[PDB]
């Protein structure tokens, strides 16, 4: 596609149904001391869009855990959906506390 419009054109598919799970896989989880490479799979496992796993696929569990429903909603449109999935993770490590 050399000739044509000066800019770029390619309107057709917005999603990318590539590299998907097939065989039975174990449950995925992240912590405050997780890697930015593990979160990528944690998001996909749950079944989150690629547009989110890409923007939140470079931040470690610690950083991601810092992002609230707002910060996550800003980086990606599925933020409110992601945070709701992370809240359960943080609550497992530490939430109410005692001291």
From Swiss-Prot:
User: Which body tissues produce this protein?
Assistant: Expressed in all tissues analyzed, including heart, brain, placenta, lung, liver, skeletal muscle, kidney and pancreas. Expressed in all epithelial and fibroblastic lines examined and in some, but not all, hematopoietic cells.
Post-translational events: Ubiquitinated by the SCF(FBXW5) E3 ubiquitin-protein ligase complex during G2 phase, leading to its transient degradation and subsequent cell shape changes required to allow mitotic progression. Reappears at the midzone of dividing cells. Phosphorylated by several receptor tyrosine kinases.
Would you say which domain of life the source belongs to?
Answer: Eukaryota
Localization annotation: Cytoplasm, Cell cortex; Cell projection, Ruffle membrane; Cell projection, Growth cone; Cell projection, Stereocilium
Region Helix bundle 4: start-end pairs: 75-93
Task: Name the segments for region: Helix bundle 2.
Answer: 61-66
The segments labelled Helix bundle 3 in the record are: 71-76
Spans annotated as Helix bundle 1 = 27-47
Q: What the record says about its domains?
A: The effector region is required for activating the Rac-specific guanine nucleotide exchange factor (GEF) activity. It mediates both barbed-end actin capping and actin bundling activities. The capping activity is mediated by an amphipathic helix that binds within the hydrophobic pocket at the barbed ends of actin blocking further addition of actin monomers, while the bundling activity is mediated by a compact 4 helix bundle, which contacts 3 actin subunits along the filament. The SH3 domain mediates interaction with SHB.
What family is it from?
Answer: Belongs to the EPS8 family.
Which disease? Deafness, autosomal recessive, 102: A form of non-syndromic deafness characterized by profound hearing loss affecting all frequencies. Vestibular function is unaffected. Defects in EPS8 are associated with some cancers, such as pancreatic, oral squamous cell carcinomas or pituitary cancers. Contributes to cell transformation in response to growth factor treatment and is overexpressed in a number of tumors, indicating that EPS8 levels must be tightly regulated.
Quaternary data: Homodimer. Part of a complex consisting of ABI1, EPS8 and SOS1. Interacts with MYO15A and WHRN. Interacts with LANCL1. Interacts with EGFR; mediates EPS8 phosphorylation. Interacts with BAIAP2. Interacts with SHB.
Purpose of the protein:
Signaling adapter that controls various cellular protrusions by regulating actin cytoskeleton dynamics and architecture. Depending on its association with other signal transducers, can regulate different processes. Together with SOS1 and ABI1, forms a trimeric complex that participates in transduction of signals from Ras to Rac by activating the Rac-specific guanine nucleotide exchange factor (GEF) activity. Acts as a direct regulator of actin dynamics by binding actin filaments and has both barbed-end actin filament capping and actin bundling activities depending on the context.
Protein name according to UniProt: Epidermal growth factor receptor kinase substrate 8
Q: Which organism is it from?
A: Homo sapiens (Human)
Upper lineage is: Eukaryota, Metazoa, Chordata, Craniata, Vertebrata
């Amino acid at each position: 596609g050399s000739s044509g419009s000066s800019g770029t054109i390619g309107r057709s598919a917005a999603q990318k149904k590539f590299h998907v799970p097939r065989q039975n896989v174990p449950v995925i989880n992240i912590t405050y001391d997780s890697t930015p490479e593990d979160v990528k799979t944690w998001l996909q496992s749950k079944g989150f869009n690629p547009v989110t796993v890409n923007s939140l696929g470079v931040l470690n569990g610690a950083q991601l855990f810092s992002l609230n429903k707002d910060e996550l909603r800003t980086v990606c449109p599925e933020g409110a959906r992601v945070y709701s999935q992370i809240t359960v993770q943080k609550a497992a490590l530490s939430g109410p506390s005692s001291g």
